[PDB]
Amino acid sequence: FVSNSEILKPFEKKQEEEKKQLEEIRGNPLSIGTLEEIIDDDHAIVTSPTMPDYYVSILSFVDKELLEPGCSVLLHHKTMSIVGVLQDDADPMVSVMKMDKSPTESYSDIGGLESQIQEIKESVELPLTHPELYEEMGIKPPKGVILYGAPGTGKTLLAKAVANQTSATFLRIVGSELIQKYLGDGPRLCRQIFKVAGENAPSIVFIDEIDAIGTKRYDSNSGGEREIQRTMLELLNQLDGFDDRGDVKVIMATNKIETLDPALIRPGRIDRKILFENPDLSTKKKILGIHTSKMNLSEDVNLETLVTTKDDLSGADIQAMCTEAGLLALRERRMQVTAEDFKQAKERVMKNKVEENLEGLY
Amino acid sequence: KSKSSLDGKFSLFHTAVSVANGFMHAGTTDNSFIKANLPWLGKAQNWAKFTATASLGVIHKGNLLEGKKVMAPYLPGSRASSRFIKGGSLYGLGLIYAGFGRDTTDYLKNIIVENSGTSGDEDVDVLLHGASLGIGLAAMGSANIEVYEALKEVLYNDSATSGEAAALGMGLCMLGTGKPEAIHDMFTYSQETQHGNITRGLAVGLALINYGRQELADDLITKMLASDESLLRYGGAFTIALAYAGTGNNSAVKRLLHVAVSDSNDDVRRAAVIALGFVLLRDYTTVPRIVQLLSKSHNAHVRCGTAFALGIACAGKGLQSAIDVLDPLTKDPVDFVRQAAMIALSMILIQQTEKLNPQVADINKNFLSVITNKHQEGLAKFGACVAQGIMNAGGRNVTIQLENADTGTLDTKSVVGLVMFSQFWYWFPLAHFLSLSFTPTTVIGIRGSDQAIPKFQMNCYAKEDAFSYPRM
Amino acid sequence: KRIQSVPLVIGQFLEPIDQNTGIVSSTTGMSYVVRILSTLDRELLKPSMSVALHRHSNALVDILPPDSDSSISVMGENEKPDVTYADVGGLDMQKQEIREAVELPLVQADLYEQIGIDPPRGVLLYGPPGTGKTMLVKAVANSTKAAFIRVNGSEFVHKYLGEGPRMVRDVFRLARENAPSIIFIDEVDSIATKRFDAQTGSDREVQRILIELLTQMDGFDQSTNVKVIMATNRADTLDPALLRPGRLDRKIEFPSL
Amino acid sequence: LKQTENDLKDIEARIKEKAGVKESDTGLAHPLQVARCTKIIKGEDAKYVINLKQIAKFVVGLGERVSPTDIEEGMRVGVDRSKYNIELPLPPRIDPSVTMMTVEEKPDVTYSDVGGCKDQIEKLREVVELPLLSPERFATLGIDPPKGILLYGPPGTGKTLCARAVANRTDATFIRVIGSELVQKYVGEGARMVRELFEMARTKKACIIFFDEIDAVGGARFDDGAGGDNEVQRTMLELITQLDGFDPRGNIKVMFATNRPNTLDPALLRPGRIDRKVEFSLPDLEGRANIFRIHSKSMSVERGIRWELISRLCPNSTGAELRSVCTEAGMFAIRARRKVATEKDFLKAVDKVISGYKK
Amino acid sequence: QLPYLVANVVEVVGKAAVVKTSSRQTVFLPMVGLVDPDKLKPNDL
Amino acid sequence: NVKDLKASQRVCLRSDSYMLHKVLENKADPLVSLMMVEKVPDSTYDMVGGLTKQIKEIKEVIELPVKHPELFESLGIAQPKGVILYGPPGTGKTLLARAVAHHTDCKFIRVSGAELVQKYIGEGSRMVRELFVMAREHAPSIIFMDEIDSIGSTRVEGSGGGDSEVQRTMLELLNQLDGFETSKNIKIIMATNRLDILDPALLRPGRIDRKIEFPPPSVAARAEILRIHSRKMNLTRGINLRKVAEKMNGCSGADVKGVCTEAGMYALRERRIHVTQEDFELAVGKVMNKNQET
Amino acid sequence: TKETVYISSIALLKMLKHGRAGVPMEVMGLMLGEFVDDYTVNVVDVFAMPQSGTGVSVEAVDDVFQAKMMDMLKQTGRDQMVVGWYHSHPGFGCWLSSVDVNTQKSFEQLNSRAVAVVVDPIQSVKGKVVIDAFRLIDTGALINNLLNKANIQALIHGLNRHYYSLNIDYHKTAKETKMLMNLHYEEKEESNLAATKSMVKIAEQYSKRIEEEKELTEEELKTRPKKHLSETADETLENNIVSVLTA
């Protein structure tokens, strides 16, 4: 505090003189650009982001061993020579990426999905904490899981939850959106996903909804589109190129597996098939139990009464029920939520979802 | 404090601090800048090195015995360190001995007649230059047709360097009522020969011979204004200024107002507002009303010339209202208007400074701020640096007068001196003529009888203004 | 004046940032932040303009009126009609129907005001074109001294997501400035057929146009200084949304007997 | 010690280099695939600049210009990736990766997932193995062994393995080329790679070029008019030309693999380039039991059980699935709370993977 | 001076041709004795 | 300084000297490309009174969080962040949406879906990204999503892949907001009356938290909607509005607006400023025929 | 550093005319005049050299052409030295090419000193003229007007680059100037012709000024505009008055 300042000011000053002397030699101002390729005759061809290419000589701040293809770099204006190195965190390297490093969601917050919880735990969490069971027996681990169901309630929740538990970077890419309408650019985009992963592990790679670029057809003539299949293949070949015991676990989302290649399953990688169901009585009890904690409510309301009229529903319906119920209580201007309020709300959403109907009792 | 803040902003920056040295140390004898920086001399250009030698001319002014003596190792027949020094030596000597140059003049005349025959090398031109400047100062105020004649042949070589000197030298000597001859011969010759430096030098040359003339000078005034050359019209103002110097005349001032407004040429406007002040020296109450309008102009040349105009006329007395005008002009957007306001302000308020007027502390502070800043331009810092020298001239004791309060009558040295002073970027070693009109404020015992130096207080009640002077 | 002179580049004004700053888009594909006119201010100046810029002194020289014509995404303009009603005989009934629907709100604002109604923004014509039906439409355009704006409704049918749906808004805007005007829609039933199923690209566009007209009609309070005439030959390939009244009130039949 | 050494080196080098580049840039300015020199102007001639880019086509054609070293200046004397005449001063088409495929001479695999592949394996023996073993017998007969083979069916599940197994047996270099890499986004970059792959095949001859994917580099499509796949078309044509043109096809075998058998381009299809069309053969009951023994040698399991038993419950499964049973029996084994796998973990592990698979 | 920009031709009155340069600009230019109007077409250098 | 330069700051760069000559403001540019902003609308929902039952429901679902967050907060509920309205088409649906917006004093932001998901590489991408920046900043604001609808007023009959691909894109943003930001009182209004080709995950809480059913109109309601609108109209005295309404069958809110403009057209044709009951009956019968078409 | 390079009227006129037709292919020629001491470069005449269809170069200068024009010039009585060179170069006016630096370095050693005059004809139609004058190297004001002597100290140590942006002025002679202004039968015809044609047209102009006033007056009312009304009243008034005055 006082101790830092006394030292700090004379210490700062020597640094600045040196720092000024550095600054003069290297110049300013500069264009930022990207390395096209790195050449060991101390040259470089560079891709300038204004477009053109210039075969340039390195100015020594770094060597070509302290440089990698596709690093971001400081360029002058002379012919665009390499003045200095810069980080790639800032300059784009993404497709569609939500990064959520250690997400808010957790198993505790989405109630009892307990049976589903147990599967995802042995495949995704267990290798990262404990390579050792896999190593001792001498078996390979699942490095992928597939989550089937609908998102927000099944697929999304389990995948957010688990990442938070393992303290890994959750990356959601939307598969379809790459579904770009020009030949050739899906394959670039797949490359950037895998590039970021290897740089920034541990990670969970979530590919949402691979069924627009996930196609694999039977043709490429007669209304066949060649890009769609190309992208699907680039994606597959990198995936099979990556293998880990606890650097990357891959979570997929999709709802058809017969649009996917049997080598994108790759039996001996994706062992696990985790699927959402509608929960049990006990787990439903837990989902209710958490959500009522947060309410102020009557004591005529029970978890038990609410269970019996339920026919097995998703956790999302239970959440939806709570928001609808409070809204009739707030409309009656009061903060007590009766057994009748939650019951009116439940009936109503169930009714809106169950638009198709079929007599099953006969 | 000043010198050491930067060495940037061209060789002009050196010219300024050389000039501020000489003013501060005037007649006190004090070489401090030169002792320290001899590398500084290596920085400096040819023309800055000529000012630096000559600045010693102001320092050793006062001693008329060791004034020559100091300059002795820098004479020819004894050589110098540099030919650029060597030239400034003969200009510094002429400063010291002016109006009593009698011997040295005959001496200096021979160098002149000598290098008209040949000496087109640039080192010999600058030698021939110094001799010509120095001798016009030295024979000033006293007719010598031998001086007129000599110098006219330096002109016939048409040196851009020497011609300037020679030309002033002919005006300076033949001060008075001129001759019909000098007027027609110079004026014709100005159209005939071509140079810019020559045109500026011969115009000011022609004006100078006309002092106290009035209507007899009216003929050359008409001819110059009738020339459509900028140089001659620049010179044309001064001719009126000088001819009518002292006596307030409405006709004379009117002629300068007409040239000043309507001509396209920017340079002429500046010279002409400067020229107003000298006629109007004795009607100094009228100047704050005239230049209230003209400090608000779209041409910067007008604003610079007016800081100087107001300054010259109102120098010998107060005028607080006057100081209020120059205020905006200090911070005026253009760099050369800032320069000129700073210089102007310092010539009036020498020992009226130092919190007599509350504002003058903010102005003095500002002079400091500019120098210390290096985001201020060469002319702005030039302006701060020489203005510092004028205020602090001869150790804060000696003063800038015109329409004196220490002698009480008009002085030839003074009017002429400021006219050289108005040009200092137009040709660089012209500053030193400010030397000629530093006046002592001295309050000393006195004897009606022959001197022996009594010193005693006369104890009468008085304000604070040896207690309010600028500060350490 | 002498500096601010033709030839100039045309660019488009986005917004004025403050006074003597505006952001402009040059039609080079380079955008600049520039100063703006001191002839205009912020009360004389609208944010969206076509503007005149200096070529090398890149600044707001002049303002133009909005413009929409280009050789991408074409629109048909037909200025100075030359057709006057009862071209074909036996359109006695129909001559009167159109007259009170289309012609009347433009020429007389005042009758709608006093009854206390607001003028219908749409008319639907069903029948074959070019029997007598088109001829009447063109005749109203003449009599009102209105620009005839011919829109082929399948022309955006452009295969891009982008330019055409944007244009249609701009066309109607350009029509309101140069009021009165007729937006005459060839086969609006073409683009009253829309996706219901996965079809991906190359069927997506008809949805965009349909929605564009709908947003405008229902989204804004009634006025008529610009009339929309829909022309239809398949009457079942419509969608109910169009046909809903309070906006589209007039259903004029072309007679076939 | 180290910190000071690095910085001095970098300042010292940089000042010399900065002086040299600026000198070479005077005029107005070894991979180059497009080469501006930014209006170095003279003139006949003295601009001598090759741009290969669609925008700006610079042709210095009509045969010879005899030069010691030179087109023109600007750090960039060269003649891009595709040559508008200009017979090759200074190294422009040496580019660091124009190869990246994986070669395995005398493969590791000889038997891995190769059980119950009998029909497939016998075909490879007659086609590949025997002309390599005796080139003289095929010459005397009058026949050619198949110039090209095309292999279809589940790919890499046993396919790549089977190929490696025959190759090892004859001591024949196995060259595995990834279809997808041949998809570089630069000019010719693509024609560069194909060419050097076939040059390598002729040097190392008595060798198999295994192309996984051939729809990565493309076959027939309607999407050539759909405005992008120009880069693709360059690669495809180059490939055909090299193969049929001057590759000897007696010992050098080329094997193609395809994902859609119906998407071949007509050039590809026709006899003289593809002769033999081989089916993938699924491991049979006996075969699956053997593969079960091979893969459990790593695992730590009881040897008193029989593999056979697991196989009866197993229905028709590719080599990949067998492997998936093996890692899953161990996960089961930890779950059931023992450090050996019983028969019973193998049975459960089958039940789980084969239902899950749903193909 | 080698090189030259190529062009395709979209107008072949008596001395005029319009050429479309590989710089996406159309110009109105006159023809000379070193061109024939028979070698002014699309698919020629 | 750099200490007044922040993220998403707009700046002005010299095009010969490439240095920051001045600084503008932070914000992203608005672009009119069908995605536009329209600040404070002018509509009122008691034009269409006798829609009262929806009025209580709307007031509480949308308005109440914005005006008083605290009630919802103190109870402990994840208060509404999206609305779906479902049920009878063509009631002058958009007018409602604006009317509520005027009351809560927010931007009505009408977004065209499909031009977020383009034939040009990413460009579409540009507009998704600008939209989200604006709407956090200018928050609270109401987004009406054009092109998803089945509601007779912006109908387009859903889509399997042209506005299901776009909703996926929307769905990432809504997910990101529930996370670290935890932003509510930022609203999306969807309305559609088909969901047998639209995705359910939108209707799950997180995005759409409340699903409210539109009421069917009645004879008693049609009479109210008519009573308000005719009030501006000059009428012939002795008229009975309940009678005219009863003669309606099925008629939604927009149809009632048609009855007054047609009643008036009939009067206009006869050069009358007053309209009898009889013209009004004849007008309703015409309006009924309009609903029967297609 | 600082030099007033004095451009003759005729030199200027011929340079702008030539340079505007000559682009986009570069054009050059030679400047004639005299050095007078230092501080002063007078340019007296300028003549064109040939064009080359891909731009003029150091390789394209031809000493026989420049020579044959001067020798023929001499027998009028035009006796000048070469003081430099002009070039068109679009997008040059504060910058120089590396080719153009090298080109200047050869030229100034032949002369005493030399200017590279680069004229830009693009912004010569925008209500301004762009021309600059350069000279890097030489002694003439790099020692009279030029840390301290910073340009020429670094210059001589090499591995440096600075343009040498000069000062420029104009004037030829008074007589030419009176003649140029006498370009503007003449003034009388012109004035009568305008007079008649004003009286015909006053019929439209009357009505149109009534609208301008009417628009202005309406604006003011809402507001209370006044500034627009003043401008707009002055313009109409002055222009009546001239129409009346003629008759």
Q: 3-class secondary structure for chain C?
A: CCCCCCCCEEEEEEEEEECCEEEEEECCCCEEEECCCCCCCCCCCCCCEEEEECCCCCCEEEEECCCCCCCCCCCEEECCCCCCCCCCCCCHHHHHHHHHHHHHHHHCCHHHHHHCCCCCCEEEEECCCCCCHHHHHHHHHHHCCCEEEEEECCCCCCCCCCHHHHHHHHHHHHHHHCCCEEEEEECHHHHHCCCCCCCCCCCCHHHHHHHHHHHHHHHCCCCCCCEEEEEECCCCCCCHHHHCCCCEEEEEECCCC
* Rounded-to-integer distance, Cα F202 and Cα B178, Å: 105
D169 to chain G, any CB pair closer than 8 A? The answer is no
Chain center to CA of A48: 30
Chain B residues interacting with chain G (CB cutoff of 8 angstroms): 6-8, 10-11, 13-14, 43-47, 159-160, 194-197, 228
F292 to chain C, any CB pair closer than 8 A? The answer is no
User: What one-character DSSP code corresponds to residue A142?
Assistant: P
Chain center to CA of D110: 20
Task: State which amino acid sits at residue F115.
Answer: E
**Sign, Cα dihedral of B390, B394, B396, B402:** negative
- What is the least distance, in Å, from the CA of D22 to any CA of chain G? 9
Question: For residue A240, what are its two tokens?
Answer: 């099979």
Quick one: which of B365, B384, B364 has its CA closest to B374? B384
Three-class SS of chain F? CCCCCCCCEEEEECCCCCCEEEEEEECCCCCCCCCCEEECCCCCCCCCCCCHHHHHHHHHHHHHHHHCCHHHHHHCCCCCCEEEEECCCCCCHHHHHHHHHHHHCCEEEEEECHHHCCCCCCHHHHHHHHHHHHHHHCCCEEEEEECCCCCCCCCCCCCCCCCCHHHHHHHHHHHHHHHHHCCCCCEEEEECCCCCCCCHHHCCCCCCCEEEECCCCCHHHHHHHHHHHCCCCCCCCCCCHHHHHHHCCCCCHHHHHHHHHHHHHHHHHCCCCCCCHHHHHHHHHHHHHHHCCC
Classify strands D253-257 and E16-21 as parallel, antiparallel or unpaired: unpaired
b/e map F276-292, b = 16+ CB within 10 Å: bbebbeebbebbeebbe
Closest Cβ–Cβ partner in C33, C118, C215 for F154: C215
Contact C195 F158 (CB under 8 A): yes
Write the DSSP assignment of D17-71 as a string of letters: HHHHHHHHHTTT----SS---TT-------------SSS------SS----SS-S
User: What one-character DSSP code corresponds to residue A270?
Assistant: B
Which of A137, A237, A259 has the highest number of chain D CBs within 10 A, making it the mutation to test binding with D?
Answer: A137
Cα-Cα-Cα-Cα torsion F280, F284, F286, F290, nearest 10 degrees, comes to 150
Contact F268 C112 (CB under 8 A): yes
Q: Which residues of D touch A230 (CB under 8 A)?
A: 183, 215-216
- 8 A C-beta contact, residue B120 and residue G37: no
Question: For residue B145, what are its two tokens?
Answer: 């047709």
Annotated binding-site residue numbers of F: 87-94
Contact D25 G102 (CB under 8 A): no
3-state secondary structure of B100: coil
Q: For chain E, give percent helix, strand, coil, nearest 5.
A: 0, 40, 60
Neighbour-count burial of A301, counting CB atoms closer than 10 A to its CB (0-12 exposed, 13-18 middle, 19+ buried): buried
Residues 6+ apart with CB under 8 A from B65: none
* Rounded-to-integer distance, Cα B108 and Cα B111, Å: 6
Closest Cβ–Cβ partner in A150, A348, A355 for F201: A150
A149 annotated binding-site participant:
yes
Count of pairs with CB atoms under 8 A, one residue in A, one in F: 104
Q: Which residues of F touch A320 (CB under 8 A)?
A: 204-205, 209, 211
* Rounded-to-integer distance, Cα C61 and Cα C38, Å: 10
Residues 6+ apart with CB under 8 A from G112: G35, G138
* Rounded-to-integer distance, Cα A151 and Cα A110, Å: 13
User: CA–CA distance from F126 to each of A175, B429, C12, C59, F120 (Å)?
Assistant: 18, 66, 20, 27, 11
Q: Which residue of F has its CA nearest to C120?
A: F261
Contact D26 G59 (CB under 8 A): no
Neighbour-count burial of B73, counting CB atoms closer than 10 A to its CB (0-12 exposed, 13-18 middle, 19+ buried): exposed
Q: What is the CA radius of gyration of chain E?
A: 10
Q: Which residue of C has its CA nearest to G227?
A: C39
Query: What's the order of all strands across the beta sheet hosting C147-152?
Result: C76-78, C147-152, C181-186, C227-232, C122-126, C248-253
Contact C55 G127 (CB under 8 A): no
Task: State which amino acid sits at residue G45.
Answer: D
Q: Are there at least 3 beta-carbon pairs closer than 8 Å between F and D?
A: no
Q: Are there at least 3 beta-carbon pairs closer than 8 Å between D and B?
A: no
A153 annotated binding-site participant:
yes
D43 to chain E, any CB pair closer than 8 A? The answer is yes
Give φ, ψ of F82 to 5 degrees.
Answer: -145, 155
Q: For chain D, give percent helix, strand, coil, nearest 5.
A: 40, 10, 50
Which of C96, C211, C224 has the highest number of chain F CBs within 10 A, making it the mutation to test binding with F?
Answer: C211
The tally of CA atoms less than 13 A away on the side-chain side of residue G37 is 22
Q: Which residues of D touch A79 (CB under 8 A)?
A: 21, 25, 29, 75
Chain A: touching chains (3 or more CB pairs < 8 Å)? D, F
Which of F75, F159, F171 has the highest number of chain A CBs within 10 A, making it the mutation to test binding with A?
Answer: F75
* Rounded-to-integer distance, Cα D45 and Cα D31, Å: 25
* Rounded-to-integer distance, Cα B54 and Cα A95, Å: 75
Quick one: which of B88, B94, B86 has its CA closest to B137? B94
- 8 A C-beta contact, residue D33 and residue D189: yes
Q: Before C105, cis peptide (omega within 30)?
A: no
Question: For residue A121, what are its two tokens?
Answer: 């735990």
Give φ, ψ of C226 to 5 degrees.
Answer: -140, 135
Quick one: which of D278, D261, D243, D237 has its CA closest to D149? D278
Contact A150 F200 (CB under 8 A): yes
Count of pairs with CB atoms under 8 A, one residue in A, one in D: 188
* Host H or E run for residue D328: helix D319-335
Q: Which residues of G touch C40 (CB under 8 A)?
A: none
Question: For residue D289, what are its two tokens?
Answer: 């039991």
Q: Which residue of C has its CA nearest to F165?
A: C200
- 8 A C-beta contact, residue G120 and residue G130: yes
The experimental technique behind this entry is cryo-EM
* Rounded-to-integer distance, Cα D94 and Cα F291, Å: 74
Residues 6+ apart with CB under 8 A from G129: G16
User: What one-character DSSP code corresponds to residue G182?
Assistant: G
Contact A262 D330 (CB under 8 A): no
Residue F250 region, left (φ>0) first, then alpha (ψ -120 to 50), else beta? left
User: What one-character DSSP code corresponds to residue A342?
Assistant: H
User: What one-character DSSP code corresponds to residue B11?
Assistant: T
User: CA–CA distance from F119 to each of A186, A189, C211, F162, F223 (Å)?
Assistant: 14, 16, 19, 12, 49
D42 to chain G, any CB pair closer than 8 A? The answer is yes
- 8 A C-beta contact, residue F244 and residue F281: yes
Q: Which residue of G has its CA nearest to B7?
A: G147
Structure resolution, Å = 8.8
3-state secondary structure of B247: coil
Contact C57 G126 (CB under 8 A): yes
- 8 A C-beta contact, residue D199 and residue D205: no
How many other C-beta atoms are found inside a 10 Å radius of the C-beta of residue D110? 14
b/e map A169-192, b = 16+ CB within 10 Å: bbbbbbbbbbbbbebbbbbebbbb
Closest Cβ–Cβ partner in E1, E22, E24 for D57: E22
Give φ, ψ of C43 to 5 degrees.
Answer: -105, 0
3-state secondary structure of A176: coil
Q: After which residues is chain D broken (C to N over 2.5 A)?
A: 29, 43, 182
Residue B297 region, left (φ>0) first, then alpha (ψ -120 to 50), else beta? beta
Q: Which parts of B137-246 are beta strand (E)?
A: none
**Sign, Cα dihedral of E17, E21, E24, E30:** negative
Chain center to CA of C220: 15
Quick one: which of D242, D256, D165 has its CA closest to D209? D256
Contact C56 G123 (CB under 8 A): yes
* Rounded-to-integer distance, Cα C127 and Cα C253, Å: 7
Q: Which residues of G touch D38 (CB under 8 A)?
A: none
Which of D48, D58, D86 has the highest number of chain E CBs within 10 A, making it the mutation to test binding with E?
Answer: D58
Task: State which amino acid sits at residue C98.
Answer: I
Q: What is the CA radius of gyration of chain C?
A: 21
Which of A99, A207, A324, A344 has the highest number of chain F CBs within 10 A, making it the mutation to test binding with F?
Answer: A324
- 8 A C-beta contact, residue G120 and residue G91: yes
User: What one-character DSSP code corresponds to residue E5?
Assistant: -
* Rounded-to-integer distance, Cα D4 and Cα F34, Å: 60
- What is the least distance, in Å, from the CA of F83 to any CA of chain A? 12
Which of B3, B13, B45, B227 has the highest number of chain G CBs within 10 A, making it the mutation to test binding with G?
Answer: B45
* Rounded-to-integer distance, Cα B111 and Cα B114, Å: 5
b/e map C140-162, b = 16+ CB within 10 Å: bbebbebbbbebebebbebebbb
The tally of CA atoms less than 13 A away on the side-chain side of residue F54 is 25
Chain D: touching chains (3 or more CB pairs < 8 Å)? A, E, G
G183 to chain B, any CB pair closer than 8 A? The answer is no
- What is the least distance, in Å, from the CA of G37 to any CA of chain B? 7
How many other C-beta atoms are found inside a 10 Å radius of the C-beta of residue C6? 7
D49 to chain E, any CB pair closer than 8 A? The answer is yes
Question: For residue E41, what are its two tokens?
Answer: 């077409």
Q: Which residues of B touch G40 (CB under 8 A)?
A: 160, 195-196
- What distance, in Å, lies between the first and last C-alpha atoms of chain A? 82
Chain center to CA of F255: 19
